[PDB]
């Protein structure tokens, strides 16, 4: 890629968007959409739920905002300490995964900002790149382990802080892309 | 080892009806198992809602 006068420019755009986008997506109490209700006992019946991971709401209702944070509750003959179960109830009742993306896109962000201070330390621009792929790992593996749960039909639909998150992910990727241009500059000039 | 269970365990385990062991069993998410004929155990397992 040339132009590399703008590329610091253009990397920097995507990596801020990419975490506004995430953290929006991760402080809003909803993903995407879905059938079920807005909090128990559009209460009971019917409603479609706006459902999330670490938060979920609804959205067209009698009533709207009622959102609620994720929980559990028992089931016939128990079968919750299974070896499976209790792995999933463990991973699923957490928002581990998108907020630990969240911190290492931020620390992406807190990375990058060493173009300036700490000047012509050069190849430290590697720690962007690990801080972007992390930061994407943590991203799909929430998002798998979100539908993975969610799927189970409720008549889901997609909605825009679930855009905001998968899109996030894309986004990573061509800003890693581009910050691994500016690292192999780098690398170009210790190596002159 | 049952019956010196079921001789003292409370609140009292034993049922006047069918009907009430079944609703115990529900009731209890299966946390209590009715002691029953098998014929009736398997009509109630054919009547819906079947858990």
């Known amino acids: ?192 | 080892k049952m019956w010196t269970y079921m001789r003292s365990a409370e609140p009292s385990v034993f049922v006047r009806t069918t009907a009430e062991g079944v609703a115990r069993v529900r009731k209890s998410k299966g946390k209590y198992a009715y002691l029953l004929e098998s014929t009736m155990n398997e009509y109630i397992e054919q009547r819906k809602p079947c858990d």
């Open chain 1, 1 to 192: 890629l040339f132009d590399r006068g703008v590329q610091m420019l253009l990397t920097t755009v995507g990596a801020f968007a990419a975490f506004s986008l995430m953290t929006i997506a991760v402080g809003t109490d909803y993903w995407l959409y879905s059938r079920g209700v807005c909090k128990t006992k559009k209460k009971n019946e019917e409603v479609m739920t706006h459902s999330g991971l670490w938060r979920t709401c609804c959205l067209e209702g009698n009533f709207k905002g009622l959102c609620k944070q994720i929980d559990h509750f028992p089931e016939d003959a128990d079968y919750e300490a299974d070896t499976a179960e209790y792995f999933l109830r463990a991973v699923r009742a957490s928002s581990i995964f998108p907020i630990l993306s969240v911190i290492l896109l931020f620390m992406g962000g807190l990375c990058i900002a060493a173009s300036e201070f700490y000047k012509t330390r050069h190849n430290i621009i590697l720690s962007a790149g690990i801080f972007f792929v992390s930061a994407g790992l943590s991203n799909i593996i929430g998002i798998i382990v979100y539908i993975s749960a969610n799927a189970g039909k409720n008549s889901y639909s997609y909605g825009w802080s679930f855009y905001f998150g998968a899109l996030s992910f894309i986004i990573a990727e061509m800003v890693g892309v581009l910050a691994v241009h500016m690292f192999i500059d780098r690398h170009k000039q210790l190596t002159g």
